[PDB]
Symmetry: C4
Subunit: 244 residues, 4 copies
């Protein structure tokens, strides 16, 4: 483990898949979204990523087992000509905020891996932190190439969630949700970032549903959001009582 | 020394040893435990580790001698077919909390070295930070593979110390007590972490006793714990004599 | 992205240019000077630098596009034998304060690249933080070689801007504005540092004009400074009203 | 002038034999650096090489005459005019690697040792400071060595010395930075030598403790060096202290 390493269990017959990322970040939006999507498509884990730039610890898993912090790749093989093969990543962590080089190298490895499957296109998901939400959560969209605005807009027409095409020039997207797109763009890849508005300090199941709604709209997939509905239901009532 | 270096004095006549880790950590628990085990077994020193990821200083040793910070490997050859040979590592320090990469590199070099002797199995010892202790220190256990819970449970049947099989999902073991097992598991190695409840800012001889009772019990060894008892008693006295000094 | 990298779009027909640097720094002085110089000369972009030592984020550009933080090289081809060709570097950022090694790597890569065009001479622009400025901001000068004092002093003869030859021995110039000269010097390159006195916590157009007047005087160019004058006046009005 | 790593720019390969490597880089009280600089001056030691490092702070310094220059270390040699005193290599400079980059300290110290070994260097003397809360008498110099057998050796070079040298006993104490690492890394390569640290308050430029340390050094070397420029500096700073504490 002298560098970031990917352990491969299975080499699935997917072709030109879309790489979807939902690693930990603001309100765990991306992580929830990605975990939900994996569950509903019954995606199969085929690989895990370990990095010596991750925090130097193991985690307690189920049944008293220890394990390094990792990220995991899942695939989904479309049964149609009408839908894309997917690779979804999610995981325990990102590189700590104090090692920028490590983010570049982890993202670099993630990209090298998905490209072996002919991956060209990336969707990242995460949250955008706001002091107060004033209604339904908006989803903020940004792309790697201008011509993709019109492309993702057409695939989004008829969607519940309000997607806002960001115009906050000089704003930043920190960590994998940005770097996979910024580094991917240098090597001929392309895609879109979708960040849901969120208070950020809580697990945000509601904002995760909105993001996943935009993403599944793009993909032309329909999936059950109830699990996320009730999580939002629960945590809302918990917050009531905490502020009393 | 562009990287972590191990200086090896001899190749000991050992095989399939268990690798035991007691580096500095919470309450100096793992360290006291390992040093006591070194001493009672008359384990022999055979290698030392230096690292450019350790703090950039020398320590004053006995006799006005300076030396880089280091870890030390000791071995014990069993006199019989019913006890495993041991490699035991301890030392001055671990890599500082700000250099995660260095922890992986030091742990990885320790694992490469110990596998040269056929090591498969690892036991790590250390502390689990707790706001207060209610009587007898408990020992928390976690393993690298599920099947090993009853393996080690069997070995531990009848032990005096209470051993809790950890259920704190998403809790963390930081540094070598954790990385040796986490990285070891990627290489097909296996083992168990045993961490003792400790206040943490004290040299905790008594929690060290409890961890080392659990470990020697798994090993089939009986080791005299006297010197640890005596250190726990001495530090107990001095602690409460500080709890009276705080009338200032 | 294993290392700091430069992407070359064009190799212009320039030779022995002067390398001018204006990266972000105190007051954004160097950066505003460089951008204004680029705009007024209509200099042309020809290369971009990316680094895994830069902060691990992408930025939002215009029209909802994401990109890695980067630096950009611009050229100006002199139309006559009495002015020098120029390479001007500017960009989003420098390496963060916590990674010294990265500053050296990025500075060394810039110098490798400009040396391909026969660059020996460097002018760095930036700011010098002061607790107050009464009067016009002064520009502090320092050079790589003692014999260059007279050299740039003659070229500065006539200038409105007051240029002080620094004597604060043991003072420091931090980041590219210092490293490009210090590293340059080891390769047989040479040049001068110009730092405008600035309060430092505001975008300092007035001090940018002052540094750029000293630089264009040295280059023998006459540049319209109006856009900077106007920006300076807008910000002084703001500051006066904000103190109220 | 690639700065991918620490690099030494060599001006001359001095005709020197088995020199003693003397280090006096910045640190506590600037004790080692003043001592080195005054030794260089009094001895007319000649500058023969310069060290630059991408692990130094990312800045240039303003020198005399409005000149910028990277931060650097400089190597000076003294050719002994006779077989009764050793040739010397003396290092000093603007700075050491920052406290946050332990790896960088090992790398820099590493390159220094590689360099001096090209000239046959075996023996190292490092000079610096040891922070105290007050000084009661004349400053003492605290000594420690790479090998036990060297205590007898340096102790018999020091008999009749006007400064008092304490063979330190603070087992577990640390020497941080090049003063420690040159000896610590050196002894891994078979080199050897001594640490001399002068008692100092640290926040002040301490010419007096520098004289103490340089007296012990020159003694060990068999050299008589005029200490007056240090005397006068110590005089100046002791009357500036007084008057700065009149106002506070
Ligand atoms: Au790496
Ligand atoms: Au990342
Ligand atoms: Au995020
Ligand atoms: Au939708
Ligand atoms: Au495209
Ligand atoms: Au390393
Ligand atoms: Au470690
Ligand atoms: Au521990
Ligand atoms: Au037991
Ligand atoms: Au690098
Ligand atoms: Au600046
Ligand atoms: Au820089
Ligand atoms: Au002018
Ligand atoms: Au290095
Ligand atoms: Au020192
Ligand atoms: Au000489
Ligand atoms: Au050092
Ligand atoms: Au003496």
């Amino acid at each position: 483990m002298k560098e970031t390493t990917i352990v491969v269990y299975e080499r699935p017959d997917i072709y030109d898949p879309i790489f979807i990322e939902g690693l930990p970040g603001i309100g765990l939006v991306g992580k929830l979204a990605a975990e939900h999507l994996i569950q509903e498509l019954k995606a199969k884990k085929f690989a895990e990523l370990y990095s010596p730039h991750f925090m130097h610890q193991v985690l307690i898993r189920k049944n008293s087992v220890v394990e390094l912090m990792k990220n995991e790749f899942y695939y989904w093989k479309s049964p149609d000509d009408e839908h894309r093969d997917l690779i979804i990543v999610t995981g325990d962590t990102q590189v700590p905020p104090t090692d920028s080089y490590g983010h570049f190298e982890v993202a670099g490895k993630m990209l090298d891996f998905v490209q072996e499957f002919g991956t060209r296109e990336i969707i990242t998901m995460g949250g955008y932190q706001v002091p107060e939400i004033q209604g339904e959560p908006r989803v903020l969209a940004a792309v790697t190439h201008e011509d993709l605005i019109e492309y993702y807009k057409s695939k989004l027409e008829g969607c519940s969630v309000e997607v806002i095409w960001r115009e906050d020039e000089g704003g930043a997207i920190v960590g994998a949700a940005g770097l996979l797109l910024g580094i991917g763009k240098l090597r001929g890849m392309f895609g879109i970032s979708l960040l849901g508005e969120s208070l950020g300090y809580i697990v945000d199941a509601k904002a995760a549903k909105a993001v996943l709604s935009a993403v599944t709209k793009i993909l032309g997939l329909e999936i059950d959001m109830t699990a996320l509905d009730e999580r939002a239901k629960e945590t809302e009532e918990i917050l009531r009582k905490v502020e009393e």
